[PDB]
Scaffold this active site. Structure first.
Site, PDB file in Angstrom:
ATOM      1  N   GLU A 253      17.588  50.273  29.042  1.00  0.00           N
ATOM      2  CA  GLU A 253      16.677  51.107  30.324  1.00  0.00           C
ATOM      3  C   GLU A 253      15.303  51.562  29.359  1.00  0.00           C
ATOM      4  O   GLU A 253      15.597  51.906  28.211  1.00  0.00           O
ATOM      5  CB  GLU A 253      17.657  52.141  30.313  1.00  0.00           C
ATOM      6  CG  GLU A 253      17.288  52.928  31.822  1.00  0.00           C
ATOM      7  CD  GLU A 253      18.253  53.656  32.203  1.00  0.00           C
ATOM      8  OE1 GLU A 253      18.949  53.672  33.216  1.00  0.00           O
ATOM      9  OE2 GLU A 253      18.692  54.767  31.330  1.00  0.00           O
TER      10      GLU A 253
ATOM     11  N   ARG B 132      21.786  49.491  33.685  1.00  0.00           N
ATOM     12  CA  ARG B 132      21.607  50.076  35.249  1.00  0.00           C
ATOM     13  C   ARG B 132      20.649  49.012  35.991  1.00  0.00           C
ATOM     14  O   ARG B 132      20.112  47.960  35.356  1.00  0.00           O
ATOM     15  CB  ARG B 132      21.079  51.329  35.143  1.00  0.00           C
ATOM     16  CG  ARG B 132      21.884  52.475  34.635  1.00  0.00           C
ATOM     17  CD  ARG B 132      21.437  53.797  35.215  1.00  0.00           C
ATOM     18  NE  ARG B 132      22.376  55.044  34.934  1.00  0.00           N
ATOM     19  CZ  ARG B 132      22.353  55.782  34.026  1.00  0.00           C
ATOM     20  NH1 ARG B 132      20.873  55.839  33.442  1.00  0.00           N
ATOM     21  NH2 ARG B 132      23.098  56.836  33.744  1.00  0.00           N
TER      22      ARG B 132
HETATM   23  N1  CL9 Z   1      16.299  56.669  38.653  1.00  0.00           N
HETATM   24  C1  CL9 Z   1      16.428  58.004  37.828  1.00  0.00           C
HETATM   25  N2  CL9 Z   1      16.269  58.971  38.288  1.00  0.00           N
HETATM   26  C2  CL9 Z   1      16.287  59.942  37.517  1.00  0.00           C
HETATM   27 CL1  CL9 Z   1      15.947  61.481  38.226  1.00  0.00          CL
HETATM   28  N3  CL9 Z   1      16.909  59.868  36.199  1.00  0.00           N
HETATM   29  C3  CL9 Z   1      17.170  58.808  35.604  1.00  0.00           C
HETATM   30  C4  CL9 Z   1      16.963  57.522  36.466  1.00  0.00           C
HETATM   31  N4  CL9 Z   1      17.191  56.345  35.521  1.00  0.00           N
HETATM   32  C5  CL9 Z   1      17.575  57.106  34.570  1.00  0.00           C
HETATM   33  N5  CL9 Z   1      17.400  58.453  34.528  1.00  0.00           N
HETATM   34  C6  CL9 Z   1      17.636  59.285  33.359  1.00  0.00           C
HETATM   35  C7  CL9 Z   1      18.996  59.695  33.078  1.00  0.00           C
HETATM   36  C8  CL9 Z   1      19.135  59.852  31.548  1.00  0.00           C
HETATM   37  O1  CL9 Z   1      18.594  61.315  31.236  1.00  0.00           O
HETATM   38  C9  CL9 Z   1      17.847  59.087  30.967  1.00  0.00           C
HETATM   39  C10 CL9 Z   1      18.388  57.748  30.307  1.00  0.00           C
HETATM   40  O2  CL9 Z   1      19.407  56.913  31.140  1.00  0.00           O
HETATM   41  O3  CL9 Z   1      17.202  58.706  32.226  1.00  0.00           O
END
Ligand code: CL9
Ligand code: UDP
Ligand code: UDP
Ligand code: CL9
Lengths: 220, 221
Positions: B34, B93
């Site tokens: 990610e 993811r």
């Molecule tokens: N689509 C996403 N929408 C939000 Cl509001 N947050 C996310 C997303 N994808 C990863 N995170 C966040 C969760 C963890 O705090 C961090 C790394 O996975 O990023």
């Protein structure tokens, strides 16, 4: 090869008026209107949300506006000498509207960074299909455009100050007339441009303007 | 063609830990992390939009969703361009969890309004319909951890911008994972094979059984 021509111009310069005229003239000429209805009802009036609170909604608006325009233009791509006339382009979205909004502090550094990155990406995937063969610049003074805003009477646009129109006008002038505005798309420096003065009402006085367009198209 | 496998799981379940174990196990296995470092310092080609979202989700959630999804797509696409024999690409993811877990939850919690949510969906559709075709999953591995385990793992990792996350937020995301991947009630995905691994127990130095499950699962695809 459908020739792709963008019609550029400040707010209420007369692009819809001009293009409604042009489309009625040859079966070989089609237009693609700016997706205004879509922006007014996504109430979900995101046009109004941006005008009312630009520092909250400009980024959101820019993303939807450009996407909706790209979708329309790609759709239109599917005659003897076919011409497709676009109402504005992905370039004016970025280098006229979005840029002015960043410059005026309605988008912060992050929003502007995210936006340019998005726009860069979208165009690598579709620059090729929507590459313009020419630009028609409908040139009108800020004062003319302010009066035409008043005339048209969109409720969302009635708060617009002359100073806003000036800022957008300077961008058009720098991009299309002086050709000093630097974009990330180099071919735009050399794309042929027809500039038309539309300060005079042309609704029933357009034979000269239409003569100029035909002549211009035949040089492409 | 490379087999594409998403690793799904709540915040701090241990996806990066797991994936960094898997990448060491074969030349044929590569990972797409990610782009968290891109989100923590917004750059181009700096603002911490991750922190912006956590501090004021009702202002920054839509902005975060578009950037995070684009950055994920870009990272996953660049990963495609492994001559290996049995090549496997593990995504941390997917575009689906962006939309169907995170964004969906933020809209349900009123961090995104109806206009933001409509716009995001329209955007997600087009982005995925134009650039995601080569990212269709062959399989999903779901690292399942209770919300309580996740919360303590958040505290362990100690990311500054995550320290305000309440248990309830993790529960909401947990329910979305369970419903999508376990109960399969939640969007081809209805059909994708899913391996579910329980990661409540620390696995950093005790992962042989997890890895054997993964090898076996991959051998069925
Ligand atoms: N689509 C996403 N929408 C939000 Cl509001 N947050 C996310 C997303 N994808 C990863 N995170 C966040 C969760 C963890 O705090 C961090 C790394 O996975 O990023
Ligand atoms: O020669 C003209 C050109 C435009 N208009 C009016 O000026 C307003 C703005 O023109 P238009 O919608 O075409 O502008 P655009 O925003 O598309 O540039 C509208 O009320 C037009 O009817 C006009 O009265 N005479
Ligand atoms: O078996 C484990 C799995 C994870 N962690 C820790 O839990 C935190 C979150 O793990 P990770 O970053 O891998 O979670 P992700 O967000 O990638 O799911 C980190 O401090 C890891 O070192 C741990 O101590 N033992
Ligand atoms: N990229 C754009 N960014 C902004 Cl702030 N506004 C735009 C954009 N494109 C069209 N408009 C506006 C100008 C008019 O008010 C209306 C129809 O052109 O939409």
């Amino acid at each position: 090869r459908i020739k792709k021509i963008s019609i550029e111009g400040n707010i209420a310069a007369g692009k819809s008026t001009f293009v409604n005229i042009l489309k009625q003239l040859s079966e070989d000429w089609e237009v693609v209107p700016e997706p205004v209805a879509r922006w007014s009802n996504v109430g979900g009036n995101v046009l109004q949300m941006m005008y009312e609170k630009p520092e909250r909604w400009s980024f959101t608006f820019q993303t939807y506006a450009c996407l909706s325009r790209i979708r329309a233009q790609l759709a239109s791509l599917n005659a003897e000498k076919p011409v497709l006339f676009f109402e504005r382009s992905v370039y004016s979205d970025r280098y006229i509207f979005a840029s002015n909004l960043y410059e005026s502090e309605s988008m912060n550094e992050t929003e502007w960074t995210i936006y340019q990155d998005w726009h860069d990406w979208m165009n690598n995937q579709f620059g090729q299909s929507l590459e313009l063969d020419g630009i028609i610049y409908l040139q009108a003074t800020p004062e003319t455009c302010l009066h035409r805003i008043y005339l048209r009477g969109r409720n969302e646009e009635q708060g617009i100050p002359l100073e806003y129109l000036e800022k957008l006008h300077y961008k058009h002038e720098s991009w299309l007339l002086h050709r000093t505005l630097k974009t990330n798309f180099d071919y735009l420096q050399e794309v042929p441009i027809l500039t038309l003065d539309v300060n005079e009402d042309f609704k029933d006085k357009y034979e000269s303007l239409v003569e100029k367009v035909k002549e211009f198209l035949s040089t492409l």
